[PDB]
Amino acid sequence: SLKERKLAKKRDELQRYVLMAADVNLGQGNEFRDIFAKSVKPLLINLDTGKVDSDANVLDFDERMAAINPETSSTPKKDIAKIKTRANDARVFKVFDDSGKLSSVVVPFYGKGLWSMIYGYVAVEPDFNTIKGVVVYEHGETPGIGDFVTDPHWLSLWKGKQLFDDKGKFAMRLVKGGVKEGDIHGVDAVSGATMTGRGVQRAMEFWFGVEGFQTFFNQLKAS
């Protein structure tokens, strides 16, 4: 029962994170639960094949646990995000507007910053390139330096940016020179905290890379 309250608490935070990333209004009170239930379709997908896998309670799926279990995980070839081990399946979310048309796909990403693992979600538009929103919800980086990652002021900068170039190659780079509106692959680095930012950069590089959600996206582009 203590289990239920905990799961109930994390499911609420999860629902809010996903809607926030997808730029959907959470409504007032507990309406976010109803909005999520109507406009979001949780999915467990096989990262290698891109196929949808089955689970009785997708929202309660423990991705931390799945990543370390030897029978449901593997070691990445190019461990860019320094995660050491990767789950076979990932939980993703398809988000639809009121018209019922696909609005975005929200996927989990995480990777080592400078001193700790950083966890979050990225919402991408149906072109699977343009970012609809980034939400970081957990980290262990030094407060006052690397804890900017959870600051909405900084996270909002990612909106509208594009992950890949015309060669289909990951192109996002954190920039210190001060990013201009036309720099669609650039995000402002937080001076004095560059190493954390490069971690987030590498986190997305992996999870939108060949060992990440690329197969899954290529499957959606087809059918």
Numbering used by the authors: 0, 33 to 254
Paste lines from the article:
We recently reported a flavin‐trafficking protein (Ftp) in the syphilis spirochete Treponema pallidum (Ftp_Tp) as the first bacterial metal‐dependent FAD pyrophosphatase that hydrolyzes FAD into AMP and FMN in the periplasm. Orthologs of Ftp_Tp in other bacteria (formerly ApbE) appear to lack this hydrolytic activity; rather, they flavinylate the redox subunit, NqrC, via their metal‐dependent FMN transferase activity. In the current study, we identified a bimetal center in the crystal structure of Escherichia coli Ftp (Ftp_Ec) and show via mutagenesis that a single amino acid substitution converts it from an FAD‐binding protein to a Mg2+‐dependent FAD pyrophosphatase (Ftp_Tp‐like). A high‐resolution structure of the Ftp‐mediated flavinylated protein of Shewanella oneidensis NqrC identified an essential lysine in phosphoester‐threonyl‐FMN bond formation in the posttranslationally modified flavoproteins.
We obtained several crystal forms of the in vitro flavinylated S. oneidensis NqrC protein (lane 11), expressed in a soluble version minus the N‐terminal membrane anchor, and phased the structure via the single‐wavelength anomalous dispersion method using the selenomethionyl‐substituted protein. There are four independent monomers of NqrC_So in the asymmetric unit, and the r.m.s.d. for superposition of these monomers ranges from 0.3 to 0.7 Å for over 214 Cα atoms. John Wiley & Sons, LtdThe modified threonine (T225) lies at the N‐terminal end of the C‐terminal alpha helix of NqrC_So, in a groove formed by a number of conserved protein side chains. Surface representations illustrating the electrostatic potential of the NqrC_So structure reveal the high solvent exposure of the phosphoester‐threonyl‐FMN residue (47% solvent accessible surface exposure for the threonine side chain; 55% exposure for the isoalloxazine ring of the FMN; 49% exposure for the remaining atoms of the FMN). An electrostatic potential calculation of the NqrC_So flavinylation target site shows that the environment in the binding cleft for the FMN is positively charged. One of the highly conserved residues in the NqrC/RnfG proteins is K207. The side chain of this residue is located near the nucleophilic T225 and the phosphate of the pT‐FMN modification. In solution at physiological pH of 7.5, this lysine in the isolated NqrC protein is solvent‐exposed and protonated, but in complex with its cognate Ftp protein, the lysine would be buried from the solvent in the FAD binding pocket. Interaction with the negatively charged phosphate of FAD may abstract a proton to yield the free‐base form of the conserved lysine, which would reduce the pKa sufficiently to allow deprotonation of the T225 hydroxyl.
